[PDB]
Amino acid sequence: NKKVGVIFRLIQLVVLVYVIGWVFVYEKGYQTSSGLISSVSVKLKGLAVTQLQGLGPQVWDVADYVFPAHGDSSFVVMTNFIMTPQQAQGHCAENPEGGICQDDSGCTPGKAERKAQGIRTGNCVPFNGTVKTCEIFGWCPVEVDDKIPSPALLHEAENFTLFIKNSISFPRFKVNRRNLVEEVNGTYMKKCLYHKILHPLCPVFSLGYVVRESGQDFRSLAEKGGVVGITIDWECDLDWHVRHCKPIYQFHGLYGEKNLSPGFNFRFARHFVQNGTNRRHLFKVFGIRFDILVDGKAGKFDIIPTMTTIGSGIGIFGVATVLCDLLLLH
Amino acid sequence: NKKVGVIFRLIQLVVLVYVIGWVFVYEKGYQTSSGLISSVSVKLKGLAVTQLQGLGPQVWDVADYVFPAHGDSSFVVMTNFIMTPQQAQGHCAENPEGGICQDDSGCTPGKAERKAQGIRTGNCVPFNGTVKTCEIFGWCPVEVDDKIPSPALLHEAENFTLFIKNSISFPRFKVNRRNLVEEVNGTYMKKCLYHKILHPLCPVFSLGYVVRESGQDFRSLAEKGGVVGITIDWECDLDWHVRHCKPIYQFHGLYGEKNLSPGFNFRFARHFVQNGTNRRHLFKVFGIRFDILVDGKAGKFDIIPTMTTIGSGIGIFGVATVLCDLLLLH
Amino acid sequence: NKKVGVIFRLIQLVVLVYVIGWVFVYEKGYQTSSGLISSVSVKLKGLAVTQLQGLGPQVWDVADYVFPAHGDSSFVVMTNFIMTPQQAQGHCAENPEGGICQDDSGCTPGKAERKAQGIRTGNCVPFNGTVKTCEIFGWCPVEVDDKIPSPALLHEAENFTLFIKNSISFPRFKVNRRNLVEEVNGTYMKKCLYHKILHPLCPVFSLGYVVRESGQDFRSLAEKGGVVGITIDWECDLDWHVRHCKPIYQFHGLYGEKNLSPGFNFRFARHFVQNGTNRRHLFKVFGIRFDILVDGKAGKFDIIPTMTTIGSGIGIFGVATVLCDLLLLH
Ligand SMILES: Nc1ncnc2c1ncn2[C@@H]1O[C@H](COP(=O)(O)OP(=O)(O)OP(=O)(O)O)[C@@H](O)[C@H]1O
Ligand SMILES: Nc1ncnc2c1ncn2[C@@H]1O[C@H](COP(=O)(O)OP(=O)(O)OP(=O)(O)O)[C@@H](O)[C@H]1O
Ligand SMILES: Nc1ncnc2c1ncn2[C@@H]1O[C@H](COP(=O)(O)OP(=O)(O)OP(=O)(O)O)[C@@H](O)[C@H]1O
Ligand SMILES: *[C@@H]1O[C@H](CO)[C@@H](O)[C@H](O)[C@H]1NC(C)=O
Numbered sequence: 009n010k011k012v013g014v015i016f017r018l019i020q021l022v023v024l025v026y027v028i029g030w031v032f033v034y035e036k037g038y039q040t041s042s043g044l045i046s047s048v049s050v051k052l053k054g055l056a057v058t059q060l061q062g063l064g065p066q067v068w069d070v071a072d073y074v075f076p077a078h079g080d081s082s083f084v085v086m087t088n089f090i091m092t093p094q095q096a097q098g099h100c101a102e103n104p105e106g107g108i109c110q111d112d113s114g115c116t117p118g119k120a121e122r123k124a125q126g127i128r129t130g131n132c133v134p135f136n137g138t139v140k141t142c143e144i145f146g147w148c149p150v151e152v153d154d155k156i157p158s159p160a161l162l163h164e165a166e167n168f169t170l171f172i173k174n175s176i177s178f179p180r181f182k183v184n185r186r187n188l189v190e191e192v193n194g195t196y197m198k199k200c201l202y203h204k205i206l207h208p209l210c211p212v213f214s215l216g217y218v219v220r221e222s223g224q225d226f227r228s229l230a231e232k233g234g235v236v237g238i239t240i241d242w243e244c245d246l247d248w249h250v251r252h253c254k255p256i257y258q259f260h261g262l263y264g265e266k267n268l269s270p271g272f273n274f275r276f277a278r279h280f281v282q283n284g285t286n287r288r289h290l291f292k293v294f295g296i297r298f299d300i301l302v303d304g305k306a307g308k309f310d311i312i313p314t315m316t317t318i319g320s321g322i323g324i325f326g327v328a329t330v331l332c333d334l335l336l337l338h
Numbered sequence: 339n340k341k342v343g344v345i346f347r348l349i350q351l352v353v354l355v356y357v358i359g360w361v362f363v364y365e366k367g368y369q370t371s372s373g374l375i376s377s378v379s380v381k382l383k384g385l386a387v388t389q390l391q392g393l394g395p396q397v398w399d400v401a402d403y404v405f406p407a408h409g410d411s412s413f414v415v416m417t418n419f420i421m422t423p424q425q426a427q428g429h430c431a432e433n434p435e436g437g438i439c440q441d442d443s444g445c446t447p448g449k450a451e452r453k454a455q456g457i458r459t460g461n462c463v464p465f466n467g468t469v470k471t472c473e474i475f476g477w478c479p480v481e482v483d484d485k486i487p488s489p490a491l492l493h494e495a496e497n498f499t500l501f502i503k504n505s506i507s508f509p510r511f512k513v514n515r516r517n518l519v520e521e522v523n524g525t526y527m528k529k530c531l532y533h534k535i536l537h538p539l540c541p542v543f544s545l546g547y548v549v550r551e552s553g554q555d556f557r558s559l560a561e562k563g564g565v566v567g568i569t570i571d572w573e574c575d576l577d578w579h580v581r582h583c584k585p586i587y588q589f590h591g592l593y594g595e596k597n598l599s600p601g602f603n604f605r606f607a608r609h610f611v612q613n614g615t616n617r618r619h620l621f622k623v624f625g626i627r628f629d630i631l632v633d634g635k636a637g638k639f640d641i642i643p644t645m646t647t648i649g650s651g652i653g654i655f656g657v658a659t660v661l662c663d664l665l666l667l668h
Numbered sequence: 669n670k671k672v673g674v675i676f677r678l679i680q681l682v683v684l685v686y687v688i689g690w691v692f693v694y695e696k697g698y699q700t701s702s703g704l705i706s707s708v709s710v711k712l713k714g715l716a717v718t719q720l721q722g723l724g725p726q727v728w729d730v731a732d733y734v735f736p737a738h739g740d741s742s743f744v745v746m747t748n749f750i751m752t753p754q755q756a757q758g759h760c761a762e763n764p765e766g767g768i769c770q771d772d773s774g775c776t777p778g779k780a781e782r783k784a785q786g787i788r789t790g791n792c793v794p795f796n797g798t799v800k801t802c803e804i805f806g807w808c809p810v811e812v813d814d815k816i817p818s819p820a821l822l823h824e825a826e827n828f829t830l831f832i833k834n835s836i837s838f839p840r841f842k843v844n845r846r847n848l849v850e851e852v853n854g855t856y857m858k859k860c861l862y863h864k865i866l867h868p869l870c871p872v873f874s875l876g877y878v879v880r881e882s883g884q885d886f887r888s889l890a891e892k893g894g895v896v897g898i899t900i901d902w903e904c905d906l907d908w909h910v911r912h913c914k915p916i917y918q919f920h921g922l923y924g925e926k927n928l929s930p931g932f933n934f935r936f937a938r939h940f941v942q943n944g945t946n947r948r949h950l951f952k953v954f955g956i957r958f959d960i961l962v963d964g965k966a967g968k969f970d971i972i973p974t975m976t977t978i979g980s981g982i983g984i985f986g987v988a989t990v991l992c993d994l995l996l997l998h
């Protein structure tokens with residue numbers, strides 16, 4: 009029958025054009041794939057001045073709000089903090105969150121099993137006029153974290169400019185590429201701000217723009233902390249010129265339900281010696297967690313993958329043909 | 339022949355059941371898989387008081403033993419340390435390990451080729467009553483680490499509550515998930531401790547439990563340090579509800595031969611200015627290394643993978659047909 | 669025809685030898701592969717003394733030039749720095765590169781839009797005898813990074829030694845391996861310098877050797893910074909003894925155009941309280957970025973992969989035979 013042969017030839021032509029357009033053209037089967045070796049360096053330029061009650065104006069610079077000063081990929085930018093100054097190890101009332109005592113017999117000497125704040129001395133001392141807390145041995149000023157300033161202490165963090173420098177190299181092809189691609193110039197790096205459409209190649213990122221692109225409001229996130237994931241994808245083709253290869257930036261927002269564990273926070277201390285006594289300043293920093301992830305591959309023409317793809321296509325064709333023949337026979 | 343046809347039909351039904359079951363349900367071929375983007379946030383609540391001979395009581399809060407303050411995925415929990423206080427730059431004798439001199443002519447001015455402790459002035463000074471070491475220009479006094487305390491200075495950290503906050507997002511499906519799940523609530527985290535069977539979803543991990551579940555003993559590991567690897571694996575079947583998505587926590591113990599470089603250790607310093615002179619405190623910290631590795635995939639029903647799996651199954655059936663026909667013919 | 673049968677048997681023998689040798693031995697189809705869990709700990713030893721104008725001799729020990737105390741995979745080794753001692757908050761002139769005014773009416777009170785150095789007060793005080801800049805609120809000694817010392821302040825960094833301790837474990841096969849191998853002993857590490865041929869397995873890497881093997885000159889890197897990538901690769905056939913399992917160390921040079929953003933740099937501050945006044949020392953450190961990446965796979969004989977490979981080979985054979993038969997059939 010003529011129509012049977014027509015259907016067979018149509019099926020073989022379909023599978024042939026499918027394999028040819030997909031394995032070779034679409035999926036780049038004639039190009040080897042390798043993995044980039046990458047290193048990310050980050051620099052933040054911004055300044056914010058905080059004026060808390062009872063304290064002088066505090067100037068925060070790049071060394072201050074960037075705790076991973078060595079330019080790590082996973083860095084935290086300080087946006088809100090609680091400062092407990094002049095902490096010294098001595099005996100005083102603990103925080104009321106741990107426990108509340110009405111008499112000295114209630115307190116027991118030892119360490120708390122859950123959320124230990126210090127070594128209990130077994131004495132109940134008044135934390136303030138109303139309630140009393142068991143006396144512990146720990147840094148004496150105990151941070152009350154219950155009050156979270158509604159206006160962010162560093163609401164200026166939104167405009168802080170952020171520069172990301174990424175250098176990727178493929179080992180098998182011995183090709184090195186950097187984010188600061190050709191189009192970028194020193195003059196450009198002075199007056200550009202990153203945008204999804206306007207300035208895709210500008211390496212200077214605005215913190216507020218990055219947060220808003222992820223899908224989070226900067227103010228509410230800075231009030232309680234947050235996590236933002238920036239991914240740099242280097243899809244590269246070596247058959248073309250290296251100028252074509254460029255870094256694509258994608259912003260991903262990592263969030264969670266606000267009732268439980270809202271935002272991101274950590275505690276850090278600055279140890280110093282004043283008047284011959286060792287003292288420290290405890291800070292509970294509510295900041296936005298920025299993670300840089302670089303994943304990419306390079307493709308360059310090679311003879312062995314081309315021959316293997318040709319053989320696989322011939323095998324798939326010769327199969328499809330025998331399968332169609334057996335189907336038409338039965 | 340009847341028996342030949344029966345064997346042929348049996349082989350056909352067997353390969354049909356195989357291609358309809360294995361690649362579809364077991365391998366989830368109709369689903370497509372996307373790697374997660376994740377961020378690790380770790381908070382350790384605990385307090386340990388270390389009493390050292392010649393020094394006052396030392397309180398080590400969360401910021402102290404957790405050296406990475408920004409909540410990095412790889413963090414070290416301090417278990418034992420060697421403290422050398424009041425280090426100042428000057429000319430003081432070197433450690434006996436570097437060299438032993440009996441006369442001033444033996445010492446050579448310059449810097450030692452390997453593991454230099456300072457700039458040798460060229461004079462042999464008595465390090466102590468018995469042996470003499472060449473004078474060097476370095477921090478004073480030089481740290482001595484020949485003796486490691488057999489009882490861990492921080493042994494209370496066996497009980498330290500470790501809270502891991504891991505937020506994942508799949509870019510292909512645009513679904514954000516966190517280690518905290520609907521089953522876990524605010525009242526649950528107050529008293530729960532992670533267990534392999536009892537509390538698999540509790541985000542609070544005990545350090546001793548993590549060490550014991552990794553095939554290591556905390557008591558022996560705390561003396562010289564160690565490396566414990568925690569892997570959080572997410573397997574998600576987006577065909578079901580998102581409540582079924584639950585993280586899987588696996589603890590892997592990374593250990594080596596005790597004879598050659600046992601445990602993990604590092605040295606850090608705190609710089610301060612006392613009495614108009616720059617001084618520092620050098621600590622040789624023996625701590626357990628914790629690495630959080632999050633690797634997972636999610637699968638949702640899609641039309642193109644389903645069609646590809648159907649085509650692959652039909653192709654496998656076709657050849658299982660002829661392979662059987664050619665064998666029965668022989 | 670006899671020639672047709674000879675050609676058929678020749679093609680049969682060719683495809684049989686192929687499916688018996690290539691996929692089995694070269695591809696290790698009978699073995700299974702699993703990803704390892706790796707944690708890297710780095711330790712450096714070396715001392716460098718920097719003598720500056722006015723300031724006394726400064727000793728930079730391991731804790732100084734190694735900014736990551738814990739020793740993460742990504743660490744920076746200080747080679748050159750710019751120190752602005754005794755930075756105290758107050759009113760001072762901004763940097764001349766920021767802005768220059770001839771009259772006080774030029775500057776406007778507020779915060780700069782880009783790269784803010786402080787809060788302008790609307791007054792112009794002379795930065796030096798020639799030009800005058802806007803008066804800002806912040807650290808009084810402004811850091812001037814126009815002059816970079818051509819001789820590296822820490823050129824002694826080239827010969828500093830680097831010890832890398834990596835422990836890898838395959839969870840599927842429950843086998844733990846370390847960079848320290850049976851060939852390496854305690855007396856060997858005392859004097860081993862890593863080399864590609866002479867000493868392949870020693871974990872003591874010379875910084876200058878690592879920089880030179882990556883393809884970069886240390887002296888140029890020392891002045892303005894650099895990036896060096898070290899990759900450890902483990903390929904182990906668990907069918908043989910575990911002694912054969914040895915890591916492979918490869919150095920990759922990550923560099924970019926020197927005209928735009930040459931080298932790697934960052935700023936960190938040391939906060940201290942002297943004379944009841946909070947001051948800091950700001951250092952602009954030019955250092956070489958070192959990144960450690962570990963990847964590997966292991967192979968163990970298993971029954972299911974062997975059976976799957978045998979089935980795939982039989983299928984490829986059965987197809988090749990008939991495809992050849994159709995070829996002759998024409
Ligand atoms: N976060 C940022 N925002 C805006 N511009 C930046 C940022 N980081 C770097 N740049 C600009 O990019 C150029 C090249 O960066 P490079 O690493 O040389 O910084 P730098 O010149 O050492 O820093 P500085 O400008 O503080 O001296 C610099 O001229 C700098 O002005
Ligand atoms: N390591 C830990 N051990 C025990 N409980 C913890 C731990 N980390 C967090 N929690 C509990 O989880 C709850 C939510 O924590 P969240 O991430 O909101 O930090 P936080 O409440 O701002 O910090 P803090 O508890 O210091 O106020 C807290 O009420 C706390 O009691
Ligand atoms: N960067 C390095 N260069 C040369 N030798 C090193 C280096 N790091 C460690 N070693 C040597 O390797 C041996 C085993 O390493 P290990 O991790 O036990 O160091 P350690 O003995 O704790 O350090 P230290 O020698 O400061 O006590 C040590 O005897 C040490 O001398
Ligand atoms: C005392 O502290 C407790 C802490 O919960 C608080 O509720 C109470 O209002 C305080 N009382 C005064 C008078 O400040």
Ligand SMILES: *[C@@H]1O[C@H](CO)[C@@H](O)[C@H](O)[C@H]1NC(C)=O
Nearest residue numbers: 163164165166167168216781
């Ligand atoms: C950021 O700068 C813009 C002007 O470009 C200003 O309107 C905005 O208030 C600034 N951000 C904050 C919240 O300080």
Ligand SMILES: *[C@@H]1O[C@H](CO)[C@@H](O)[C@H](O)[C@H]1NC(C)=O
Nearest residue numbers: 190191192193194195196197
């Ligand atoms: C600077 O880079 C931009 C990139 O958009 C380019 O358009 C411009 O021509 C460059 N400047 C010079 C002087 O080449």
Ligand SMILES: *[C@@H]1O[C@H](CO)[C@@H](O)[C@H](O)[C@H]1NC(C)=O
Nearest residue numbers: 434435465466467468469484
């Ligand atoms: C002196 O120091 C050396 C260091 O190895 C030690 O062996 C010796 O016992 C010490 N002698 C005294 C009297 O402390």
Ligand SMILES: *[C@@H]1O[C@H](CO)[C@@H](O)[C@H](O)[C@H]1NC(C)=O
Nearest residue numbers: 520521522523524525526527
């Ligand atoms: C808290 O979570 C636990 C999970 O084990 C659950 O059993 C309990 O009902 C929850 N509490 C409330 C009030 O729902």
Ligand SMILES: *[C@@H]1O[C@H](CO)[C@@H](O)[C@H](O)[C@H]1NC(C)=O
Nearest residue numbers: 764765795796797798799814
């Ligand atoms: C003053 O500072 C400017 C800053 O660029 C410099 O160009 C100039 O040479 C300096 N003048 C003197 C006398 O130091």
Ligand SMILES: *[C@@H]1O[C@H](CO)[C@@H](O)[C@H](O)[C@H]1NC(C)=O
Nearest residue numbers: 451822823824825826827876
């Ligand atoms: C490093 O090389 C040799 C040791 O091999 C040493 O003598 C020389 O002084 C050093 N040079 C530098 C640049 O530190």
Ligand SMILES: *[C@@H]1O[C@H](CO)[C@@H](O)[C@H](O)[C@H]1NC(C)=O
Nearest residue numbers: 850851852853854855856857
């Ligand atoms: C130390 O290791 C080296 C490896 O090159 C080996 O040749 C030597 O025999 C070892 N020393 C001892 C005492 O076994």
Ligand SMILES: [Ca+2]
Nearest residue numbers: 082410412740
């Ligand atoms: Ca890291």
Ligand SMILES: [Ca+2]
Nearest residue numbers: 281611940941
């Ligand atoms: Ca101080």
Ligand SMILES: [Mg+2]
Nearest residue numbers: 105152153154
């Ligand atoms: Mg609280």
Ligand SMILES: [Mg+2]
Nearest residue numbers: 435482483484
């Ligand atoms: Mg030692």
Ligand SMILES: [Mg+2]
Nearest residue numbers: 765812813814
């Ligand atoms: Mg500059």
